[PDB]
Every structure is written in C-alpha cells, then in structure tokens.
Amino acid sequence: TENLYFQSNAMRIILLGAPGAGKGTQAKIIEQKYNIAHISTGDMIRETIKSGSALGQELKKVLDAGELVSDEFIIKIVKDRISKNDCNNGFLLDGVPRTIPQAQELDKLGVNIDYIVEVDVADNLLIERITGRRIHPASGRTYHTKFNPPKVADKDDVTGEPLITRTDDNEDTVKQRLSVYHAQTAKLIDFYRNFSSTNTKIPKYIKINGDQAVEKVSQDIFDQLNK
Amino acid sequence: TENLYFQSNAMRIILLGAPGAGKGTQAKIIEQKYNIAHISTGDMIRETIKSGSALGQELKKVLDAGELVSDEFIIKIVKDRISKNDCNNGFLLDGVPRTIPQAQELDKLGVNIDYIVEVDVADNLLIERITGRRIHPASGRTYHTKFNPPKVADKDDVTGEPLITRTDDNEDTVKQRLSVYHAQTAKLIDFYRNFSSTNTKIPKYIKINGDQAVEKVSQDIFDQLNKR
Ligand SMILES: [Ca+2]
C-alpha cells in the first residue's frame, strides 16, 4: 500500500533551434515540468572528459590529437548518458543529432524519439541577438547593445574599460553559421519526415513560434506534447 | 501492483565546497545517479528571471536596480524552484544557504535536509586551481598555467593574441574568497551540528577528500550517502 509510484510513459525529445532562438531556456522549462534529463552536447562532452571513464579517456585522446569527434562516437556517448538513472522518465536531446549519420546511429543504437520540437525564430531577430553582444574581457561582464546596454557605449559600467565583440559574434560569421544551421536542420527534418525504420519509432515533428513571451512559447510547446 | 513501485523518501542535500574544489562536477554525478535536481544559485536566478513568472519579474527588477538579493528573497526563489516536478525525488542545493539567516529561513519553510556534503581540498591546491587560469577574451578559449598550458606563455594557441588573467582570479582576491568561504562554512556546519529546531531534522554532515580522482571522489560520496 506504499507501492504508489507509477512510471509514466517515456517523454523523449530532440530539441532544435538556431543560435539566439532561446531553446536553452525552453529546455530547462521542459525538464523541470516533465521531470526528464536535459542532455546538451557541450555539457555531456565536458562531463565525459572529467569522468576518467574509458569513454572519457578515448575522447580526451581524440581532442588532444586535434581530430574532431566522430558521429558514431558522440552517439556512443549519448547512449551511455541516457542509461543513467536521471533518464528514467525520458530525456531531451539538445545538440544531437546534428547530422544524418548521427540520427542513423541513434536508430541503430535503438534510441527511440517521441518528438522533434523546433523553436523557430526569424533570421533577423536571431542576427540581432548575437551581433549585439558585448563583453568586458577582464571581468567577463556581459552587455547587449539593444537588450542590456552599458551606461556609456562600448565601455564597462564598473571600470570604464572598453568592451569588445567576441570574434564569432561578428555579423558575417553569424549569418554564415546561421545558414549552415538552417541547411543542416532542413536535412534532419526531412530525414525524420521520411523516417522509415524497423529498430525505432517515427518521431512527431513540432514547429514552435519562438517569437512570443517565454511563458507563451512554453505553453505552445506544452499544448503540442499533450496532443 | 502493476508497474507500481515503492514511494521512496526524497533525498535532500546541501553541497559545500570552495572555489576550485570541483563540487560542480560531483553535483552532476550525484544528480545523474540519484535522480534528484541539482539546484545551483546562479542558474536558478538566471532561469527565474527568463521565466516571466511574477516572482521572476520582481527578481529581475531587484537585479536591474543593481541591488542585492536578500537572504529572504533567495530562499523565496528556492521555495519556487523546489516546487517543480523535477524536485519531487529530492534535490541538491549548491550555493545556498550561505548564511545563517538563509539556513533559518530554509528551516522555517519546512525543508528537511538529509545530508551536508563538503568536498574538502587543501587551500594550496584550491588557490593554484584558480590563479593559473588564463583566457583569450576574443574567442573565450581558456587555458591553465599548470593543468592545460598554452603552447607559448601568455599567448593563444590558435591566433597568437595575448591571454589575460580574469580580475577576480588574482591571488589576493582568491585568498580573500577562500577565507570567507571557510568562515561561512564553519558557521554553517556549527549551525547544523547544534541544530535544535522543532520544524526540521538534524542533517548528517559528511566531509569528503576531494583531492582524489573524480570517480574515487564520487564513490566516497556514494559510500557515505548510502549508509543506513
Ligand atoms: Ca529527474
């Protein structure tokens, strides 16, 4: 009569969204409401390197040789990450699959995905969100030329020392990385749109208007998952 | 009983450790093993603001005013955070309570803390771990004078531009923060050891040798958490 924990159906999500779209905020919100693991690649890699595990030893080897992480290998890391107890209820993938071979390896590794949730925000707004970023390098204090401006243009509020724009946040780099995002993503969705497998299920594709209040973006997402 | 299981008691942990002690790494590890939420003050504050919540709105105004979040307000923020579904199985508090009034406020709320876990590392090692940090500002590429050196001193590997030390990574500041942490931590331990509260329980204090391999530090922690 104390056996009253019911394991509900797994909620397993691939989250997609451009640099600047604010998908990281939605991921935390989903994680906290549905009680599933937010798995982001950046975190997963660093934690793996720190672990001292064989997986981590092999990864640290690769990265010290200059070679980039293979698709088969990053998905092997994912499979391990999702074997953990905090993934009992499902998970949210944030950063993988980034390519067709990654998605194929997930299928072959037997990882089922229920939803693909894409937070869509207009290119121009995305552009402005990245390119406006400033930083005071010595302290790391952040500003944004539109969303969080300094008292005096291009100067740190505390010290008066000049701000800089990070190298990657220049307009041309943003637009180029933006383009490869949209192309890499469009191929991923059409892959999943024409998904045909005997090892895993066909995920439901969901496209969210991310140009609304945060609480509204969240509800639109919630409404879709429940449908 | 068809796919029904025993409702276990939630585990609630206060995690303590000085800057550079690696507490952040162990928190993630504990989170993943025990399926409890890792709540760090920094993230909690950023999230609450970005939420559009009424509480989040007030918090953003306090901070936009350049004011400090009071002891009472930070616990109100903790109260909202731990009401979420990912906290039903328990949580690990990281960065709160830092003061006695936070611990008292936490206690008035009815939060029962099962364990205090202190990841202890010698001061000489802590200081070294912070002071040897260097960054290339334009890229954000980071290095460590000992643990991950650049190929040429004070120079970024990729571009060759100079590296800097962040201002708070200076030895004078590092020592000062170390001294504060140890003092506040002593007070905290003392508070919970002499715990004579009517509303919440007496936590089990666990001190951990954090100067070991990550996997060994975790297993020591598990060992203590798993004791009957
Ligand atoms: Ca959980």
Side-chain angles (χ1 to χ4, degrees), chain A residues 2-59 62-63 65-66 69-78 80-97 99-145 147-150 152-170 173-174 178-186 188-198 200-226, chain B residues 1 4-45 47-49 51-154 156-171 173-175 177-186 188-192 194-195 197-228:
Chain A
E2 291 201 77
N3 309 330
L4 300 168
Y5 179 68
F6 178 67
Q7 182 53 61
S8 60
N9 195 262
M11 154 109 292
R12 284 155 313 186
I13 293 154
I14 296 169
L15 185 64
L16 308 171
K23 69 183 166 175
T25 289
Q26 295 305 321
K28 307 297 199 186
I29 281 164
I30 293 161
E31 169 186 34
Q32 292 177 21
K33 184 174 215 66
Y34 293 88
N35 183 29
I36 60 184
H38 173 197
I39 308 193
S40 79
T41 49
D43 287 342
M44 189 184 70
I45 299 307
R46 300 169 209 132
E47 296 158 19
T48 297
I49 293 175
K50 291 325 187 60
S51 65
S53 74
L55 279 176
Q57 294 166 41
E58 187 62 18
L59 178 56
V62 167
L63 297 165
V69 200
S70 98
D71 294 350
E72 190 171 346
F73 187 40
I74 194 171
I75 296 311
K76 192 165 148 206
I77 296 169
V78 165
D80 177 65
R81 170 62 179 94
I82 67 177
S83 75
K84 304 199 178 312
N85 290 322
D86 73 335
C87 295
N88 60 315
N89 238 27
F91 52 85
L92 191 310
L93 299 179
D94 181 354
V96 280
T99 64
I100 306 309
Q102 288 177 25
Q104 290 177 325
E105 194 73 22
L106 280 180
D107 177 35
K108 180 177 66 175
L109 259 53
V111 182
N112 282 268
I113 305 296
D114 300 296
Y115 299 97
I116 309 166
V117 178
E118 182 182 16
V119 186
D120 186 53
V121 177
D123 269 21
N124 66 315
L125 290 169
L126 297 173
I127 298 305
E128 184 181 27
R129 289 181 185 170
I130 318 293
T131 72
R133 289 172 176 174
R134 292 306 177 271
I135 187 176
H136 173 233
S139 79
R141 275 178 299 269
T142 48
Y143 302 84
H144 188 282
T145 195
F147 291 127
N148 185 29
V152 164
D154 317 286
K155 315 294 179 183
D156 181 52
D157 292 341
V158 172
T159 62
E161 296 169 13
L163 302 182
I164 60 163
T165 298
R166 269 177 279 197
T167 321
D168 292 332
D169 294 343
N170 69 88
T173 292
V174 176
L178 229 286
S179 278
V180 321
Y181 162 82
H182 282 296
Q184 250 184 347
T185 303
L188 251 170
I189 296 164
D190 178 76
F191 174 87
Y192 276 119
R193 190 178 164 88
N194 310 320
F195 196 66
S196 181
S197 174
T198 204
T200 64
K201 65 178 289 184
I202 311 165
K204 170 161 190 291
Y205 174 64
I206 298 172
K207 188 187 175 66
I208 302 295
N209 181 11
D211 186 19
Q212 312 175 90
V214 178
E215 51 282 16
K216 185 42 169 46
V217 172
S218 301
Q219 193 62 46
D220 280 9
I221 287 171
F222 296 166
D223 294 345
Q224 287 305 303
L225 300 184
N226 309 338
Chain B
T1 297
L4 298 158
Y5 308 103
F6 178 71
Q7 289 276 10
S8 61
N9 289 318
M11 185 168 57
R12 309 185 169 81
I13 293 168
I14 288 171
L15 180 65
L16 300 174
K23 79 183 167 197
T25 292
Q26 296 297 329
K28 300 303 172 194
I29 284 169
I30 293 159
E31 175 172 55
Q32 295 173 20
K33 183 73 176 186
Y34 293 93
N35 186 27
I36 57 185
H38 173 210
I39 300 173
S40 61
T41 50
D43 287 77
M44 176 176 59
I45 289 173
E47 294 159 12
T48 299
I49 278 159
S51 91
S53 169
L55 176 68
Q57 274 191 242
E58 180 81 340
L59 175 54
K60 177 187 181 300
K61 291 170 189 182
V62 163
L63 293 180
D64 279 352
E67 293 295 331
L68 285 101
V69 181
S70 73
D71 286 334
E72 291 93 340
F73 200 0
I74 195 66
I75 300 306
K76 279 293 190 161
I77 299 166
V78 170
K79 172 189 150 77
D80 188 72
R81 172 72 180 86
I82 70 181
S83 71
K84 307 234 180 296
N85 288 323
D86 71 338
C87 290
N88 298 344
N89 197 34
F91 50 78
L92 176 144
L93 291 188
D94 177 6
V96 67
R98 275 165 216 168
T99 62
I100 306 310
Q102 291 175 20
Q104 297 178 332
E105 208 62 27
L106 197 51
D107 168 80
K108 281 164 196 140
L109 195 55
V111 175
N112 286 282
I113 298 300
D114 301 287
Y115 305 95
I116 298 166
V117 181
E118 181 175 16
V119 179
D120 185 69
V121 173
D123 281 354
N124 49 288
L125 298 172
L126 294 171
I127 289 171
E128 178 196 81
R129 290 191 195 172
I130 313 294
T131 59
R133 289 200 278 158
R134 302 294 183 270
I135 184 178
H136 175 250
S139 57
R141 272 186 297 284
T142 63
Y143 306 91
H144 197 278
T145 280
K146 155 150 197 168
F147 286 104
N148 184 246
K151 294 168 187 182
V152 160
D154 308 77
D156 190 50
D157 282 8
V158 166
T159 177
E161 304 171 47
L163 301 180
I164 73 176
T165 299
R166 263 177 265 105
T167 56
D168 288 341
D169 286 356
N170 75 76
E171 184 146 6
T173 305
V174 173
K175 281 192 172 60
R177 263 151 174 69
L178 232 66
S179 171
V180 168
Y181 162 89
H182 281 311
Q184 268 300 352
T185 300
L188 256 197
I189 304 321
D190 211 307
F191 180 80
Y192 282 121
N194 304 327
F195 213 49
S197 170
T198 167
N199 208 13
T200 70
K201 70 177 280 190
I202 300 87
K204 181 59 185 185
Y205 173 68
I206 291 162
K207 186 175 177 183
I208 297 295
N209 178 7
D211 191 29
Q212 308 182 85
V214 169
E215 186 183 283
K216 168 67 172 169
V217 174
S218 299
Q219 192 53 61
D220 281 357
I221 288 177
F222 295 171
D223 283 351
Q224 298 306 314
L225 294 178
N226 292 353
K227 280 184 169 175
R228 294 202 55 79

